[PDB]
């Protein structure tokens, strides 16, 4: 469940 | 019944503790209210199905055949009702049996008519 928005974040890094 | 069972347990464990003072020991008990109990059991086992039939009959049988059926149902209940069923005596018992037979014949005739 934590993976979803972590991916949300790492899009531009 | 349960208080009598507990008391009967008490008489059992006192007569086994009083063996040397008693030679003869019987347990013949015929209480007088058991026939009355059977009379009220038979009275519920009349009145329950009479109520079940009569409520349905006055509910859904609203011709002169239907008025004849409800009048014969009322006549059967009055013919049983006029007999004193609370008597545990023998003549009252035979009057109760005759009322039961008359009610059954009237009810079966009404059943075949409907």
């Amino acid at each position: 469940l934590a993976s979803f928005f972590n991916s949300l974040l790492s899009k531009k890094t | 019944d349960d208080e009598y069972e507990k008391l009967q347990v008490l008489l059992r464990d006192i007569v086994k503790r009083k063996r040397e003072e008693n030679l003869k020991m019987v347990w013949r008990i015929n209480p007088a209210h058991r026939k009355l109990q059977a009379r009220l059991d038979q009275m519920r086992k009349f009145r329950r199905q009479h109520e079940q039939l009569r409520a349905v009959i006055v509910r859904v049988l609203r011709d002169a055949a239907d008025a004849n059926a409800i009048e014969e149902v009322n006549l059967a209940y009055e013919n049983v009702k006029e007999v004193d069923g609370l008597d545990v005596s023998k003549e009252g018992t035979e009057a109760w049996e005759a009322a039961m037979k008359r009610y059954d014949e009237r009810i079966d005739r009404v059943e075949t008519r409907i």
């Binding site: 469940l1 974040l9 531009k12 | 019987v26």
Partner: protein, 106 residues
């Protein structure tokens, strides 16, 4: 820990709002709010998973109560049926052995 459809749906709406707020202003909106949201989101799934266990335990133990009550009632009744047949057999055959005793005494 299987996620339900309802928690996935409202987390999807949270994902929608978070993508909209990321696109609208900057990255710095989400960087402290999403760890304060994801633990509550885990807690929703945890309390639903515990609640369903409570429900199935309630149903099985309830039906075991109604099994127990009627089984005990039937067993009490058949103990009573043992306890007057004893009495009837006892006094009947005691009267017969007593009449046999007095007829053999004379």
């Amino acid at each position: 820990s299987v996620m339900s459809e309802r928690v996935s749906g409202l987390a999807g709406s949270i994902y929608r709002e978070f993508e909209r707020l990321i696109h609208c202003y900057d990255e710095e909106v989400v960087k402290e709010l999403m760890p304060l949201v994801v633990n509550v989101l885990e807690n929703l799934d945890s309390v639903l998973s515990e609640n369903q266990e409570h429900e199935v335990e309630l149903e099985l133990l309830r039906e075991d109560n109604e099994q127990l009550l009627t089984q005990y009632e039937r067993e009490k009744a058949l103990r009573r049926q043992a306890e007057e047949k004893f009495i009837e057999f006892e006094d009947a055959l005691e009267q017969e052995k007593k009449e046999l005793q007095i007829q053999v005494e004379h």
